[PDB]
Amino acid sequence: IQKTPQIQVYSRHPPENGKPNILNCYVTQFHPPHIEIQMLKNGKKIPKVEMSDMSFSKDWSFYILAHTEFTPTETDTYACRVKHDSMAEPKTVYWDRDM
Amino acid sequence: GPHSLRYFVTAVSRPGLGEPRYMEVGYVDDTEFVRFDSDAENPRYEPRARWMEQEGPEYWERETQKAKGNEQSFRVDLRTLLGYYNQSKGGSHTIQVISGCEVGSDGRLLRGYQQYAYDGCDYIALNEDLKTWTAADMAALITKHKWEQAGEAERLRAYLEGTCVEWLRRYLKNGNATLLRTDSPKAHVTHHSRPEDKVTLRCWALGFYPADITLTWQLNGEELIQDMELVETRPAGDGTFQKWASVVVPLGKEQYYTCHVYHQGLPEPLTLRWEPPP
Amino acid sequence: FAPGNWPAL
Numbered sequence: 001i002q003k004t005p006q007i008q009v010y011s012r013h014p015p016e017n018g019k020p021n022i023l024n025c026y027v028t029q030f031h032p033p034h035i036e037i038q039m040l041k042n043g044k045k046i047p048k049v050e051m052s053d054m055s056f057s058k059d060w061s062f063y064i065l066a067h068t069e070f071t072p073t074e075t076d077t078y079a080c081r082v083k084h085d086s087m088a089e090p091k092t093v094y095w096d097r098d099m
Numbered sequence: 100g101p102h103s104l105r106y107f108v109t110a111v112s113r114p115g116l117g118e119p120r121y122m123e124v125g126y127v128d129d130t131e132f133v134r135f136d137s138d139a140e141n142p143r144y145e146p147r148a149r150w151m152e153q154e155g156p157e158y159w160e161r162e163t164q165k166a167k168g169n170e171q172s173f174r175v176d177l178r179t180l181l182g183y184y185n186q187s188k189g190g191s192h193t194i195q196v197i198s199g200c201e202v203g204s205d206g207r208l209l210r211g212y213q214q215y216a217y218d219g220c221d222y223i224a225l226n227e228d229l230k231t232w233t234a235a236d237m238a239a240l241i242t243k244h245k246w247e248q249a250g251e252a253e254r255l256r257a258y259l260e261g262t263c264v265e266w267l268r269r270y271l272k273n274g275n276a277t278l279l280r281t282d283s284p285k286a287h288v289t290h291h292s293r294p295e296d297k298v299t300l301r302c303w304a305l306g307f308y309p310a311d312i313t314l315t316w317q318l319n320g321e322e323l324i325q326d327m328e329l330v331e332t333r334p335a336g337d338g339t340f341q342k343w344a345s346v347v348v349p350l351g352k353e354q355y356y357t358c359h360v361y362h363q364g365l366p367e368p369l370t371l372r373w374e375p376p377p
Numbered sequence: 378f379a380p381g382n383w384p385a386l
Binding site for chain 2: 378379380381382383384385386
């Protein structure tokens, strides 16, 4: 009995073009714990991506924080792809700077 | 109160990769204060809060050697459950356990508990009496029969009532100022229009700790839980958390709606409304 | 003080 990952893509500080910032990918509500989290930029994969220690909550499901430093602009599109056995194909969530 | 000392244990079999991975993670009032991970360069118990650096070397050695012994036990338990479910050795499986105790402001034991789960499903759990168990399926009835005739619940009762409480009591004193912890949220309301007769009002709460928080939108008194939309509380990545709730409202009726932020660190709940510069 | 001597399933 597996569980599909809930994903939130968002920045640490209020976004502002041409100013350095951290981009988060908070993945939760997933089981089994094995998972791949890729962060994207205009399609291309971001090479330098940190990962928090994995934990699990009182409903047994796991959660983890992935993040990478980035400088937002007018026209750059950032996203976060996630592979998991619960899903038939990967799940790409795109960054909305108002969410 | 209520204060808690919980230990979260994970054991995952990894056929065709290596040995099973093992993690223990201790929490004090839902705050990670210790951690052990077998996939580290040199597996040992390490502090996850700076108030734990008080404890001496004998503590760390004792907890470290204990974790390695626990790893081997869960290594055997993984192979035992394969037998109970008649499962293949070449498939990955996950055993999880939460085991802890809770105390009130007085220090008395409110609830002691320990519960297991296999592949994300409840397996067996110790009842609130701390005497009998509750098996989740036919496999767990085998374990239920063992521990009852073994009298294992009684040995757990000693740990949960005595040891767990006494140590929890100790940690709270060592990290009293750190666990007193409160950052008030910085809150605001953004306006997100659209080529349409409606607009989206979004209420934010940033830079707050602990993660416990409640955001609500109200229309002239009543709370709009059904038509509201909100995200689960999320880490900013610097010790604080974020959250937002939103509502879609008619164009030109933004001042009719009111956002409310409820949080420990606040003297009183914040009351927010859409305001332009303009 | 984590639990030691975990009982076998």
